[PDB]
Each structure stands twice: as C-alpha cells, then as structure tokens.
Design a binder for this molecule. Sequence first.
Ligand SMILES: CC(C)=CCC/C(C)=C/CC/C(C)=C/CC/C=C(\C)CC/C=C(\C)CCCN(C)C
Ligand SMILES: CC(C)=CCC/C(C)=C/CC/C(C)=C/CC/C=C(\C)CC/C=C(\C)CCCN(C)C
Ligand SMILES: CCCCCCCCOCCOCCOCCOCCO
Ligand SMILES: CCCCCCCCOCCOCCOCCOCCO
Ligand SMILES: CCCCCCCCOCCOCCOCCOCCO
Lengths: 619, 619
Amino acid sequence: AYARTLDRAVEYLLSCQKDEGYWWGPLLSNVTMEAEYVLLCHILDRVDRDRMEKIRRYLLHEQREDGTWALYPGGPPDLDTTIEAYVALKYIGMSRDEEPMQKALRFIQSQGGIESSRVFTRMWLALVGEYPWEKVPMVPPEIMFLGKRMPLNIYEFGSWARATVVALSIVMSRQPVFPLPERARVPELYETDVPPRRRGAKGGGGWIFDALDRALHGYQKLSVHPFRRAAEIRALDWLLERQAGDGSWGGIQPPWFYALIALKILDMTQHPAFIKGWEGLELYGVELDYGGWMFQASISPVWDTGLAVLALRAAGLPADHDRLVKAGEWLLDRQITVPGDWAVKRPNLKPGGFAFQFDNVYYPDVDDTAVVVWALNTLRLPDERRRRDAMTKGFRWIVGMQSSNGGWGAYDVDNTSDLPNHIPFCDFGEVTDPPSEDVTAHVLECFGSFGYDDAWKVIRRAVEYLKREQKPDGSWFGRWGVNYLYGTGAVVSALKAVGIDTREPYIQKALDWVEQHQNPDGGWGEDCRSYEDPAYAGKGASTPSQTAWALMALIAGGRAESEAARRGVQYLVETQRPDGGWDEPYYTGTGFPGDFYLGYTMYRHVFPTLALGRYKQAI
Amino acid sequence: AYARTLDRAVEYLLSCQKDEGYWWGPLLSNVTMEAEYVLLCHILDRVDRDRMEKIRRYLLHEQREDGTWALYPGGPPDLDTTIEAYVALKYIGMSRDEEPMQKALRFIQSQGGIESSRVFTRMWLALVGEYPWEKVPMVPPEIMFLGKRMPLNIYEFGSWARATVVALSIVMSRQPVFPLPERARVPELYETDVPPRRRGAKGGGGWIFDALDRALHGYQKLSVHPFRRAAEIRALDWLLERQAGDGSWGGIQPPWFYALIALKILDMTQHPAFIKGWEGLELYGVELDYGGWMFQASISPVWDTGLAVLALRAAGLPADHDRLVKAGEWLLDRQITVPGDWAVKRPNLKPGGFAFQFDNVYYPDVDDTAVVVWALNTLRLPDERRRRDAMTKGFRWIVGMQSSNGGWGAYDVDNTSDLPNHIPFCDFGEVTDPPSEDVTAHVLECFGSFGYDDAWKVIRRAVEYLKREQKPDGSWFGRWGVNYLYGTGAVVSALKAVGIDTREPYIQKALDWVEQHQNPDGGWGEDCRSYEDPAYAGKGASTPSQTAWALMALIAGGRAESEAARRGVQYLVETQRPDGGWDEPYYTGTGFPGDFYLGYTMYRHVFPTLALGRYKQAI
Ligand SMILES: CC(C)=CCC/C(C)=C/CC/C(C)=C/CC/C=C(\C)CC/C=C(\C)CCCN(C)C
Ligand SMILES: CC(C)=CCC/C(C)=C/CC/C(C)=C/CC/C=C(\C)CC/C=C(\C)CCCN(C)C
Ligand SMILES: CCCCCCCCOCCOCCOCCOCCO
Ligand SMILES: CCCCCCCCOCCOCCOCCOCCO
Ligand SMILES: CCCCCCCCOCCOCCOCCOCCO
C-alpha cells in the first residue's frame, strides 16, 4: 500500500535538505510584499531596474484573468492587494490603458476605490503623496511614554504589531512624502460611484479612540510639540535595541520596511543599523524560474527543520542517522540564550526558546520551541551533554511561558487585552497574541515525548483549556494553519501523546468529525474561506498537508485499521508525484484569520511523510 | 638646486594614491593597541592562533635591546606599555624564563610594578582577573543621568574620552572578570621592593573626587542599586545611536574595544551592532612585511588626502589634474550633513564638517574640515556647484564652531571645563578638548585661501587668541603635531595667510626662534621629549616633516632667500631617496602631550613636497 510511497517521500525529503543540515522552503503570501518593496526602493532612492522588471513579471503572473489579486490561490478578489499591485505596476512602467491595468482598475472602482481600503494601503499611498496623511489614523511617538501597566502601552500589542507601531510612531510623527513621478500618480483610484465601504478596527468602532485620533491630528498642525523629540528618541532606541542579526525587525516584512523608512527620515542612512537592515533584505528575496522575483513575508527554516526531523523519525530513520545528526547539531546552535520582549511578563524566567527565522533572538515563539525540543528528544547526538542541556532549557522555558488560561500563545504570556482592536489604526489582522489551540497542542505533544502525562499539573490545565475551546460540532480551531482540520488534527494527536484515553466521548466526537469530513478522493481539504464561513469548515479541494493532519488524528485515536485511514493513505499513495513529493497549489498556512494567508511550501512533503510514518508504526 | 627633487616627490606622492582617489598611510602609535587587542580576543573568546603569533612577532620586534617598550621611537622606557606587552606575550605563549621577558620584568619591577601603572592598564588586568576591580577608579552608569549643565556630565569631556567613559560605565558597573589560563597569570608583576609611584589624576589632588570614588565603590558592594539598570540602558542607547558606519565608535581604538566588551557582558554578541563592531576591526589591522601585525589607533585617509592635494597643488600640479579631480570628487562624498555631538553646544548650526576616518559622521573635526575645505578651494572639478556648496557648508560650520576665547578646538565649542581632569579615572592623556593654536592656525589658513583677513571679527579674535598663547621665546605649542616647530610653522603660515604684516615684532621673534634651532645638518627636528622637558623645545634629530614645517614658517615670513631656508631646502634635496620619498624613523604626530604619540607615515612625503612647492612659488 504505502511502503514504496514512504521510501520515496523519505528520499525526496532528504534530497531537499541543505548541506548545513536544515530545511527551508519559501513562504508564499500575496503581492503587497513586492508592491511595498517597490515603493520602499522609491522612498530610499535605490531602484534597481532589473529587479523592478522581475517584479513586474511577478505581479502580472499573479494577476488572475479578472485583473485582480487575492490573499490566497483560488481566493476571492482582494481590494487592498489589487490597489497596491496596480500602483506598483504604474510606477515600474505599465500605462493605465493596458488591459491588465484597465481590468484591475474597474474592480478597484466597483469596491469603492481607495476610501474602502485598509489603513496600511492608504498609508503607503500617503508616503508617496497619493493620499492625505490627515486621513491616516495616527500612531503618535508619545505612545512610548505609556508605562507597563497602562492602557494601549506597546506591550499589550502582540509581537508583530508592537514593532510595527514603534517604527510607524516615528514615521507618522513626521508625515513624510516622497512624490511619485507625475506619470505614476493614480488619481483614477478615487474616481468611483460606490460610496466608501468602511471597515474599522477589528472588533468595532468605539468613539473614544475616534476622538483621540482627531485630537492627535489636531496636535500635528501645531508647531510646538513638547516632549515629542524625547518620545521619538525612545522609539528609535527601542528599534536600535531590537534589530535582529539578519538586519530585520522581527524577521517580518512590515516592521522591517517601516523601520528602514523611520531611519531614512531621521537621516540615518549612514548608521550601521540602516546599512545592515538594507543589505539584509536580499536573504528574503527569491528568484523565480519563470523570470519573476518575490519577497518573503517571513522565513521558516527552524520550523521546516524541526518538522523534517519529526517526519523522518516517524517514517523510520534512526535517532543517530547522520543527516538527522547534522540537523540536530544545527538546531542546537539556534537556541536563544537572552531575554526577549516575553521577559516583560516573565522577568525571572531563564531564556531557552527558539525562533522561526535564522537569527531573531528577541522573538522566540512557543511553537518552534515545542517542535524543536521534541525533535531533539528523538535524536542521538555526539554532543550528548549539550543536547540534554538544550532540551532542559527549552522544556523549562515553555513550562514558564504558559498563560493563566492553561494554554500557550506564540510569543507571550497573557497577551490578551481587548483594547488594541478598537483604535482606528488596527483594522487588519490580529494585534494581540492570546493562547491558541494549536501551539498548546504542540507543547503537549512535546511534553508527551518526554513521557509526561495528566498527573503533572501543567498538562492538566493545558487539557482543560482545550476542552473549553472545543467547538460544538466537535472540532478545534486552527490559529496558524488551515483550519479546523489543522487544529483538530494537532489537538487529538496531543491528547493521545499525553496519555489521555481517546475513547472518551469528546475525542470520539472529534475523530468522528474528521472521519465525516473525508473527501471522495480519500484525502481531506479545507479552504481559507473557512475562517469566514461555517459552511467551509473542513471543506475544500484535497491537499496533501491537510490529509496528513486528518490521517494523524485518526491514527492517534487508534483508527489506523479504519477504512477512513486506508482511503487517506491510498490518496497519498496515488497523488504522490513521480519524484516522491506532492503538489499543493492551495495555501494551508494562516498568518491572520481572514486577512493574511501563508503557503508553507514544505508542508506538502513533510506532513505526508510524518502521517505515513505514524501509519507504519501503528501497524 | 631643487627642481628634480620636487618632480620626483610629486611622482612618488602620485604613486601612493589609491585607485579610488584618496591617500591613506598607516597611523603608528605603541604596542598597547595590540596588547589590548590580544586581551580583547581572550575576553570575547575569539582567539585566532595565526594572528596571535603575528602579534608576538610584532611585540618582540618593537622591544628594545633593554627589554622595554616606548611611546615613540627612541623614547624612554614606558612602564604601562611594557606591562601590557609583557602580559600579552605571556598569554600568547612566552615563558617568564625567556630572555626578552626577563629584561622586561626587571624593568617593570624597578618602577614599582603594577601599582605604579595607569588606570587603563590596571583596568585591563582587572578584566582578566589579575588586579582587583575594587582598586580601579569607578565610572558609574549613573553619569548618564547628569544633564548638560551639571558637573561631570559626559558633554564636559572631550569626544574621545566621552565615548570611552560611556562604554566603561557599563563595564565597571558589572566588574566582569575573564580569567587568564593559569600559566599566563602574572603575580610576578607585583613582586618589588620599590614603592608605588602613584601619578594620579592629570590635573591634581581634588579630594572631593577621591571621596566620591570611595563612595561609588561602597555603593558597588550593596546588592540593590535603584535606577542603575535605567542608567545602563541610557549608556547602551547612547552607544547604539553613535556607532560609526565602519563598526567602530569614534574611529578610535579605546571606545571601540570598550563598547565591544560592554556589548559582550550584556549578552549582545548576536546583536548586529556587535557583529559589525567585531567584523569592522579588520579594516584597522595591518599585516607587516616581517610577519607581524598591528592595529591602528585611528585611520587618517581624509587628513592624508587633504594634505596630499594641498602639497601637489603647491608643487604645481594643475587644479584640474585628473588625479586631483578624482581626489576632490572623493572628498565631496565624505562631507557630513547630519548633527553630531557638537550640536549639543550648537543646536541650530547646519552640519558641514569632515571626519579624519572614512565613516565617522558624529565626530567631524575642525582640523580635517579646514584642511578639506581649503583643498577643495584649490581644485577645479566638473561638478562645480557641488564644490561651491561643499565649501560653503564647511566654511560656515567652522565659523559656528569658534570657541569664546577666539580659537578652535578639534571637536567641540568651549570644551574647557577644569573638572574632568581631577577625577582619579583621568590619569592619562587629555580628557577635554579646549581650543589649541594649531587647529586655529589651520582654520585661519583655510579662511585666508578665500581672501578673508582681519577686517573680519572672527579672524581678529583668532589672531588675538594666538598672540595671547605665544610663548616667551616666540614659539607656539603644537597640540596635535610635534611640537613648537609644528605650532610655530602652522601659526606663522596662518598669520601670513590672513594678511598680517610678518614684519611685526612678535612674528619676527618667532622667525628668529625657528632659525636659531636649525640643526647643523641643515634640517630641523624636535623629539617628543619636548612636551615634558624644556631642554628639548625645538630640538631633536632632523626629520623631513619637521624641516618642512620650519621651512614653511621661514617662507611665510619672507625669508625664502635666507641662508637658513637655503640650507633647509638643501637638506631635503640631499636626504630624498631615489624613489622620491623620504625616510622618517621618528614620530612627529601628537595624540596627547606627554602620553600618546603618533607616526603619520605620509608626513615624511607630503610635507617636504608642500614646503618645496611653497619654496618654488616664493623664488
Ligand atoms: C499591526 C499589524 C497587524 C502588523 C502586521 C502586518 C502584516 C502584513 C503582517 C504579515 C506577517 C505576519 C503573518 C506576521 C505575524 C507573525 C507571523 C509569522 C512570523 C509567520 C510565522 C508564524 C509564527 C512563528 C507563529 C507560530 C506559527 N507556527 C510556526 C505555525
Ligand atoms: C579618557 C581617554 C583619554 C581616552 C583615550 C585614550 C587613548 C589611549 C587614546 C588614543 C587615541 C587618541 C590619541 C585619541 C584622541 C583623538 C585622536 C585622533 C582621532 C587622531 C587624529 C586627531 C584628530 C582628528 C584631532 C585633530 C588633529 N589633526 C587631524 C592633526
Ligand atoms: C525599558 C526600556 C526597554 C528595555 C530594553 C532592554 C535593553 C537591553 O539590551 C538588550 C536588548 O534587548 C532588547 C529587548 O530585550 C527584551 C528585554 O526586555 C525589556 C523589557 O522592558
Ligand atoms: C525613568 C527613570 C528616571 C530616573 C532618574 C534617576 C535619578 C537621577 O540620579 C542621579 C544620580 O547622579 C549620580 C551621578 O554619578 C556620579 C558621576 O560620576 C562621574 C564619573 O566619576
Ligand atoms: C538622550 C538623547 C540625546 C539625543 C541623541 C540623538 C538621537 C538621534 O540619534 C541619531 C544619531 O545621533 C548621534 C548623536 O547625535 C548627536 C545629536 O545631538 C544630541 C545631543 O543630545
């Protein structure tokens, strides 16, 4: 049935490994990354024309026959994304009367033009002089004076939003304008009959923050701003302190680009932080085969590496396999040894976490730390000692990063304030980082590998948390992977890993949910529409990664002998490519529910390998 | 008499020019640079063995037959320098039983050993666990809380000392120890029957500061220190904000090394500031022909380039000579347009200065700026508006930088506080940057090149300053070049340049002083012993550079046809090498009067060329 399939998948996965020992696939998102990169180059006056032409080719390739762009493959047309792409194409050279532009425009106009678009988009236009800064919600540098136990202070925001806010607090302080060339100006994006379609803050429009915003814009027009410089210096210092080793801020595109703009308008282009921040960008760019270029929203080598190790061990390679040892020794050198922003909440907790990217010491996340400690537990490394020390250190850091709920968030403990999702600025994505089902499940899986179970109180409060968040139909949500399949799969595997008897009715209603959502081709799929439509829960075109997750839920509950598992295994057998991998033209990653989706290009290979491995061991 | 000499000197100077258009000769000092680099490597745990063997070769090469090291070629044995060399050599692998080490030891013990050494030397030993931190004068991080009108605030210190103090405020706060290997310890440096020779604070016996020091040391022993952390963050932020583009702090060895140690003990070796600061060190290293390696205290490319332009122009190379045009265009790109520490005194003055190094935007100096603006004024470049622009900004920046007494210091306005000199940390070098005669002279020559004279009040006040500072024998002191020959040559040139009547009695006295110090070989020389011994005033083995400066005085003062001047030119003619250059085995540069001397390796070529050129013009 599957032995040849596994032999081949294992062979393919091994062939993807880099010489230094890690795995790293590109992380796909949407064209605002490259659209914004083009405007960044304009702002910094560093436009490489060959790079621009590659981006043009990339943007045209991602444009559907509609003339629109989306957040995900097969996704509905997205207005913000389409505006940004249109604008970047005009700047590069596309005339507006060319078919691909005429189409994109017509759509932009049917959605209410620029006024319907998100803050970020209107702010990028404002930076190049195509939208008034007066109508851009204001993040003032004086946010830096708010103390650690005060409302809207920067440590109430989640890690990704924080760094964005600090950098933009400098940019918005100054309201800088870098005029486009006359021919690239885009007045046509206002010319519409549809009145604005105004989204506000992610939860809703509360009047207090609307008024604060109007007061802050009033404050802007005065010539004297007492303590403003001191606030700007606080913002700058916060950024200088936290720049990552790769030059980025947070290993993610938004605060990186905004920090570079902040440094530019502070006349700091000769400062080493700027020089490194600019030069570091190439690491995240990817030359595409068809002649395009893209920029990665973030980079995923630690995550890909920990999973490849776990897949290859499940599938049957030994603990001391030479390429797994090279990987394990690589992962040891990645452990973070210094306090990050998480230490605001846990000032006496010893560092031992892991980040997602190569070098991002101030922002380790619990997911990567869980998967890496686990992976290293499956291994036998010639540095016997520093391997135990490493797991010890990681283990204990995850223990300490547990939130009050019982569950774990990604970066912080108790990052659960409701206040940030009500300022006008925050109309896109999550802006806090509360506990999630999936990372909790993953630390539970980690802990279970060390032989720990429900007797220990840490796991108890973890199991309870999950039970409280189980959905009424029996599924679990996917915060960072799509979606009910991703979370339900993670959770059941974890419940099994930590000794919980899987014949209990809550886990039987879970396994029934998975078994009941099997596609007629034998696999499972789940579309990104699932974050905004109940009808789409566990519904989509089958993908290899999501099939894997359902298969692993079934196997964890002792349903390997079941027809469902056997139909899912055969599906993996039958859709495998000649080379041992699987195609996956749909995103199964989540950045923000409803607003930002990710294609982890390695999921299609690693996860089927892991799943099939769990099948082999179960029989 | 001199034509071939000049033609060959011009050809030789031109052969020394880099392809890119600048000149740059190594800057020589003393072995504490490398001895401290060795200890730095030990502290960071980054010891390159090949590098260590080259440093050992260098240390041994520089050691005199008596076992000692000195501050300058032919100088008296220097205790501090000899101690640091002995320590580095023992670390690298020499045994105390070996003969070079025995002689050094004997000298060290004869001076009272380590208890007789300067604070820096005791501090380096404390850093490696060979001297008690308890006995090292304390620079507390709380200095960062002193505002700019408070005594001992960091802006009362000279720029070199300021950065040193900020970095060491972090270091001393933690009193970190990085023990030497057991075989490298140096207890034998305390074994003496000669009492401690305690040369304390540079200025004298301020009991207030000795009491404050004992109190800070007592404070150090308590376990809670309110606001200390906030003070350390201030110091860190100050350093991060000011790191130069080459990775250094201030383009000089001390704050660079201390900033790296500071970053290390804050567990910040993965921070990009550390990474760039560490990697940037290689630019300052120089591989020597006999297999040694040295580290430059600073680097002089702007200064060497400005001076080469002025010398070549004086020799008769045209203003639009393609190699001078290369050099002028390169100089234009070096101008600094951002605020530096100087803006603390001058917050509304437009940036326009030049630094000494390649990239040091926060620390332009008045000497480089005057010389570069002057040099640009002798050139005709194809971007003539950019040249005029640059000269205007630079000219006006110098004007705004004039101190209250009419002279100019190197980096700051009115850096004249008498307080920094009396604290027990400050027992080495100058720690403030008050106006000096040589920088003022250079400013005046720059101004005179544009046709300004003592109808302008700025020049009148500067000339009055120079008159008050003239010594009883008619000479002027040389703050940055050695010594009375340097200052007198600069000042007489300058006074001629701004239209003073050189027949005035005070100038004629200076000119007679120059004549009466001519050596019997026709040259002039002045040993660095001059700063500490009145018997060496204008006296020393003849050098090409110091002969050039004496000649420049004589020519500026109307005596080009004097016997003295003819003999000086003949000395230069007769001592030139076949290749067009001159040998100069003595230092003629000054870091700090009495304590730190400099070998500007281009002076021996550039200054003879300038003086011969001016001589040709006169005749
Ligand atoms: C104010 C706001 C919202 C600013 C952000 C705007 C914006 C466009 C963000 C897009 C980029 C983005 C998804 C940022 C959030 C952080 C997400 C990533 C690092 C991707 C990798 C995810 C993690 C390691 C969390 C754990 C996930 N597991 C590894 C499975
Ligand atoms: C607290 C204290 C004293 C710390 C410093 C200790 C120490 C060992 C210093 C050695 C290095 C040193 C001499 C630093 C002072 C700054 C000197 C230089 C940049 C060399 C070039 C000089 C200048 C541009 C000033 C202008 C002079 N002209 C260019 C001709
Ligand atoms: C309270 C002002 C910000 C504190 C910055 C800490 C500076 C230490 O330097 C190392 C850089 O670390 C970057 C941030 O590290 C997180 C430590 O938590 C600080 C929370 O106050
Ligand atoms: C938000 C935190 C603000 C807290 C302010 C702290 C109170 C200020 O403390 C001033 C202490 O001053 C001591 C100065 O230290 C001596 C300097 O020594 C000079 C070198 O020898
Ligand atoms: C305590 C804050 C002092 C202001 C520091 C300036 C912050 C901006 O940094 C840009 C690089 O600045 C290097 C230093 O520039 C000196 C400007 O004068 C500031 C004197 O407070």
